[PDB]
Structures are given as C-alpha cells and as structure tokens.
C-alpha cells in the first residue's frame, strides 16, 4: 500500500509529502525490506498464494522500473 500510494499520490494520508525534485535515480526506497520479502518468498514458496504474491511483485517492479527509466530519461534530456 505504501509503494502504491507513493507511485500514485496517496502518500498524504501516510504523511510523506511530494517527492523530491531532480531525484529520478533514487529518492528513498528501503531495499532491505524488498530483500527480506524476496528471501521470505523464496523460503516459503509452496501454495498458490506465494506464486500470486511473486507475480504481483514482479509486475509492480517492472512498472516501477519503467517509470524510473522514463523519469531518468526525461531528467537527462534537459
């Protein structure tokens, strides 16, 4: 929910304001959390819930990577 609100605009309820400008590379993304999540998924991969969570995480990561690449290209074009 936090990363979805950040990608959208719903971070006002979470308390985080607008993202910092001129930071198309990396603003503030805790990679340790996603590393622990990937480790837990790889260790507890069993039922269909794990596969669904992995697919959702892969789709979200692909969308975030595409958005970050677009933002970096738009920032470097200027």
């Amino acid at each position: 929910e936090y990363v979805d609100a950040l990608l959208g605009k719903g971070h006002q309820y979470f308390g985080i304001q607008a993202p910092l400008s001129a930071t198309s590379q990396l603003v503030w993304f805790p990679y340790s959390a996603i590393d622990h999540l990937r480790l837990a998924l790889g260790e507890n991969e069993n039922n269909q819930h794990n596969q669904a969570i992995l697919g959702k995480l892969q789709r979200k990561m692909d969308e975030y990577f595409q958005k970050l690449k677009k933002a970096t290209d738009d920032y470097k074009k200027i």
């Binding site: 910092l20 400008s21 001129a22 930071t23 603003v27 503030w28 340790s32």
Partner: protein, 294 residues
C-alpha cells in the same frame, strides 16, 4: 549493531567512546572498556537514516554535527557527560550528502554538502551564532562529495623554522556528477576557481583530499562509475598541478575513499565487496599489502 544498516561509525579522539549512526532513527554511543562494550547514550532526533557524523577537536570543544535524511542537520552540545540538541538547520529540496569539519589551525567550519545545485557553508565561532552562506549556481546536477585543504598554504613546500604562519584562507574541493573536478579558493569571502582538468570520461562519483598531518602534501583521490581512480598529487611549492595517475583499473562504483588520521593510508570501499589497503610505500606509486572484507 550488525543487525542494522551501519554506514560508518566514529571514535573519540582518545579511543574509548564509539558512536554508531544506525538506521533506527537514532544514534547510539558505547563506551568500550577492557573487553566488552556498554551502550550509554541513545540520541533520538534524526529524521530518517543518518549518514555520518564528523568529530571536532579537543582544544576547541566536542561537537558532533549529525547529518540525517529529510534534509536536516543537527548540531549538539555536551555538558557534564550528557549530549543535548542546540542547533537545527533544514530547508532543502534534494537530499543532502555528508558533512565534514576543519583541521586544527584551519578552524571549525562545517561544510554542508547539499545536492541542491549550490554550496552551503556553516561557520561557527565557538559559542555564538552560526553564519550560513550559500554559493549558488554550481552546474547541472547537485554535488556529491566535498573536502577541505590543510591548515597551511596549498602546495608541499619546505618552510623555515619560526617563519611560517598558517593563514585563515579557505580552500576546498567539490566533486559531483559533471565528468570534471574543480577546486575553489576564497579569501574569507571570495570563492574563485583555481585549475581545470578534463580527463574523466565518466561521471565522477566521489573525491577526497588528504590533508597530511605532518607535511603540506596536497593529494586528491577521485573515483567514478567505471573505476578510474586518479591520484591527483600536488608536490611542488606554492602553485597548483595535478597528475592523473590511474591507481587500479577497477570495474565497480567506489563510493568511499577514506583517509587515515594522518591522511597517508587510504581505505577504499565500494562495489568490490572487499577493502584493499593500497598503502604508499617508501618509493611512491602504490602497493597492496592488506586485503580484508567490506
């Protein structure tokens, strides 16, 4: 401890007090004695992760200016063995990098390396206000690393006994994402360039000057994205000259090139998962005699 994301801890000038800027939105302070360690201080008041805290000087006063995320820096003060807040400076859009202090005779000026496309310098006398000056219009992107010059004049020159007076002129270097490396010098209110170099073919990641406590030898170690580690050493007299000497053809992105307390030993830390102490032997160039983990 090891369960957190510790960037780089600091030690007291004596060597009995240790401070870790953990990722728990706080800074821990242990007192190492005999063998085991004891956590005494837990300073809470740093928004987000804390980068690194630089030490001041014993003859000038214990000051640990902490720099954390959310674009803010906190200057504290110690009394009766207890630390407490005394100054807070915020108001930035881009994330601030790291901060550093000045040597002995150079003074006690705090350099706030902000990536806002400008330079913010905080000068503190000793127990009064803080003069915050802003030099705008740097280049396209914000800065990354900043370093200072030794207390004496730049340039390793043998002076006469009882005939050298370290002036209060300021000289510093700032390296960012601009494929270049510059050096600024001011006369207490007149920042101007010194030299220009065009040798880096990639984005310069970080730079670090080595103010040797024993010789006025000016040497700046730089690191980029590819791995071009150039040792810009100035060993002339009073002018300025840098020679691009490729230390090792690295294939990573080195982010830290720390110097020892005498600015003679270099500790490299980056994307190599190891730390190789490429010390300077008694014949120049470099020599790798020790290699440990990251």
């Amino acid at each position: 401890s090891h369960e957190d994301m510790i960037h780089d801890a600091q030690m007291d000038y004596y060597g009995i007090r240790l401070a870790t800027c953990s990722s728990d939105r706080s800074v821990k302070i242990f007192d190492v004695k005999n063998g085991g360690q004891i956590l005494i201080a837990d300073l809470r008041g740093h928004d987000g992760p804390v980068w690194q805290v630089a030490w001041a000087h014993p003859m000038y006063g214990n000051i640990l200016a902490s720099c954390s995320y959310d674009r803010k820096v906190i200057i504290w003060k110690e009394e009766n063995g207890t630390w407490e807040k005394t100054y807070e400076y915020t108001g930035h859009d881009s994330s601030v990098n790291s901060v550093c202090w000045a040597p002995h005779d150079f003074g006690l000026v705090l350099a706030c390396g902000s990536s806002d496309g400008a330079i913010s310098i905080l000068t503190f006398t000793g127990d009064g206000p803080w003069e915050v000056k802003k030099i705008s219009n740097a280049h396209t992107i914000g800065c990354n690393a900043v370093s200072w010059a030794p207390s004496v004049i730049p340039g390793s020159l043998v002076d006469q006994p009882s005939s050298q007076k370290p002036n209060y002129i300021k000289r510093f270097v700032s390296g960012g994402c601009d494929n270049l490396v510059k050096i600024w010098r001011e006369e207490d209110g007149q920042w101007k360039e010194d030299q220009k170099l065009e040798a880096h073919s990639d984005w310069v990641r970080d730079v670090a000057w080595a103010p040797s406590i024993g010789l006025p030898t000016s040497t700046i170690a730089s690191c980029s994205q590819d791995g071009r580690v150039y040792i810009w050493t100035s060993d002339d007299a009073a002018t300025n000259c840098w020679t691009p000497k490729l230390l090792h053809k690295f294939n990573d992105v080195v982010w830290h090139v720390s110097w020892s307390i005498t600015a003679n030993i270099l500790a490299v830390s980056g994307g190599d998962n190891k730390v190789t102490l490429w010390k300077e032997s008694v014949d120049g160039q470099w020599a790798c005699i020790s290699d440990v983990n990251k």
